[model samples]
Target: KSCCSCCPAECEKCAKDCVCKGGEAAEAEAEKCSCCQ
Candidate 1:
């Protein structure tokens, strides 16, 4: 059970850096989603 699958690498980096804000984190993740595709 890996929820991290499909998640962008940048998301992990961001998660490690500052993983407390949902809205900001989500937006940043969505932005990184475009990085792969």
Candidate 2:
């Protein structure tokens, strides 16, 4: 995924793997998203 800087690696990976181009996987992983958001 195209990270907008400051995007955590876990979230970045999640976003990259997302099929909808939205951070669905990252959003689902609350623990990782907490730091990402």
Candidate 3:
């Protein structure tokens, strides 16, 4: 499982992979992922 707290990098990847599933909301979440930047 990719979690931002446990694996921020993977969480970013997962978010981009449609795991977050909220379009702009996903982007916002990804932006705060730490590894996304």
Candidate 4:
């Protein structure tokens, strides 16, 4: 997962379908998530 410009230094919790910060699905696009944002 990536940190949102909206919520930098934080994880994208309520993100849509792994959309991270934006309202875009991150299915095909695999991102890393591990407090790693």
Best by TM-score: 3
CA-lDDT, candidates in order: 0.39, 0.41, 0.47, 0.39
lDDT of 2 by residue, 1-37 (tens): 2343335444544365532244545334333333445
Worst 10 residues of 1 by lDDT: 1-10
Q: What order do you get sorting by lDDT, best first?
A: 3, 2, 4, 1
lDDT of 2: 0.41
Query: What lDDT score goes with residue 11 in model 4?
Result: 50
Question: Model 3's lDDT to the true fold?
Answer: 0.47
Tell me each candidate's RMSD, in Å, in order.
6.2, 7.2, 8.0, 8.5
Off by over 4 Å in 4: 11-37
lDDT of 1 by residue, 1-37 (tens): 1123334444554456434234534444343343233
lDDT of 4 at 3: 39
Give the per-residue lDDT digits (tens) of candidate 3, residues 1-37: 3443324455555666645545644444334543443
The worst-scoring run of ten residues by lDDT in candidate 4 lies at 1-10
TM-score of each: 0.21, 0.20, 0.28, 0.19
Cα error, residue 1 of model 4, in Å, equals 11
Q: Candidates 1 and 3: which is better by lDDT?
A: 3
Cα distance off (Å), candidate 1, residue 16: 0.4
RMSD of 1: 6.2
Give the winner by lDDT: 1 or 2. Answer: 2
